[PDB]
Scaffold this motif. Sequence first.
Motif, mmCIF file in Angstrom:
data_model
loop_
_atom_site.group_PDB
_atom_site.id
_atom_site.type_symbol
_atom_site.label_atom_id
_atom_site.label_comp_id
_atom_site.label_asym_id
_atom_site.label_seq_id
_atom_site.Cartn_x
_atom_site.Cartn_y
_atom_site.Cartn_z
ATOM 1 N N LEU A 1 0.817 -1.199 0.000
ATOM 2 C CA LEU A 1 0.000 0.000 0.000
ATOM 3 C C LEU A 1 0.858 1.258 0.000
ATOM 4 O O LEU A 1 0.507 2.265 -0.618
ATOM 5 N N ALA A 2 1.980 1.192 0.698
ATOM 6 C CA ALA A 2 2.894 2.323 0.789
ATOM 7 C C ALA A 2 4.055 2.167 -0.188
ATOM 8 O O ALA A 2 4.610 1.077 -0.340
ATOM 9 N N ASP A 3 4.412 3.261 -0.852
ATOM 10 C CA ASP A 3 5.502 3.247 -1.820
ATOM 11 C C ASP A 3 6.773 3.832 -1.223
ATOM 12 O O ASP A 3 6.762 4.373 -0.118
ATOM 13 N N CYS A 4 7.871 3.721 -1.964
ATOM 14 C CA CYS A 4 9.148 4.242 -1.509
ATOM 15 C C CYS A 4 9.429 5.588 -2.152
ATOM 16 O O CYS A 4 8.514 6.367 -2.417
ATOM 17 N N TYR A 5 10.701 5.862 -2.388
ATOM 18 C CA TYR A 5 11.111 7.110 -2.987
ATOM 19 C C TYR A 5 12.372 6.908 -3.812
ATOM 20 O O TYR A 5 12.805 7.796 -4.546
ATOM 21 N N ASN A 6 12.958 5.728 -3.670
ATOM 22 C CA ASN A 6 14.175 5.379 -4.376
ATOM 23 C C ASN A 6 13.867 4.736 -5.721
ATOM 24 O O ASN A 6 14.707 4.715 -6.621
ATOM 25 N N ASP A 7 12.657 4.207 -5.847
ATOM 26 C CA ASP A 7 12.233 3.555 -7.080
ATOM 27 C C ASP A 7 12.597 2.076 -7.055
ATOM 28 O O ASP A 7 11.965 1.257 -7.722
ATOM 29 N N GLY A 8 13.619 1.740 -6.274
ATOM 30 C CA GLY A 8 14.053 0.361 -6.171
ATOM 31 C C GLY A 8 13.763 -0.233 -4.807
ATOM 32 O O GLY A 8 13.972 -1.425 -4.585
ATOM 33 N N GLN A 9 13.277 0.601 -3.891
ATOM 34 C CA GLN A 9 12.955 0.151 -2.544
ATOM 35 C C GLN A 9 11.448 0.047 -2.353
ATOM 36 O O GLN A 9 10.672 0.621 -3.117
ATOM 37 N N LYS A 10 11.040 -0.687 -1.325
ATOM 38 C CA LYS A 10 9.625 -0.868 -1.025
ATOM 39 C C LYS A 10 9.332 -0.514 0.428
ATOM 40 O O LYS A 10 10.235 -0.148 1.181
ATOM 41 N N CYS A 11 8.067 -0.624 0.817
ATOM 42 C CA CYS A 11 7.662 -0.314 2.181
ATOM 43 C C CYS A 11 7.760 -1.547 3.071
ATOM 44 O O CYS A 11 7.575 -2.674 2.612
ATOM 45 N N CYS A 12 8.050 -1.322 4.346
ATOM 46 C CA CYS A 12 8.171 -2.409 5.307
ATOM 47 C C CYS A 12 7.545 -2.020 6.641
ATOM 48 O O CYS A 12 7.529 -0.845 7.010
ATOM 49 N N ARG A 13 7.028 -3.009 7.360
ATOM 50 C CA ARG A 13 6.400 -2.763 8.652
ATOM 51 C C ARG A 13 7.445 -2.395 9.701
ATOM 52 O O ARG A 13 7.576 -3.067 10.724
#
Length: 42
Positions: free
Chosen positions: A29-41
């Motif tokens: 549901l949440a995106d990153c900002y690096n384009d290659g990274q993802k969200c984590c709890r």
Amino acid sequence: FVQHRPRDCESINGVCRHKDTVNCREIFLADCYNDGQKCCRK
């Protein structure tokens, strides 16, 4: 101004790790900002 970007990860109280981390639950549901990274709890 800004662009047409949905939601990130930090804007949801999450973290930005690697899309290939390991056990850092990702937030489909949440995106990153690096384009290659993802969200984590966190």
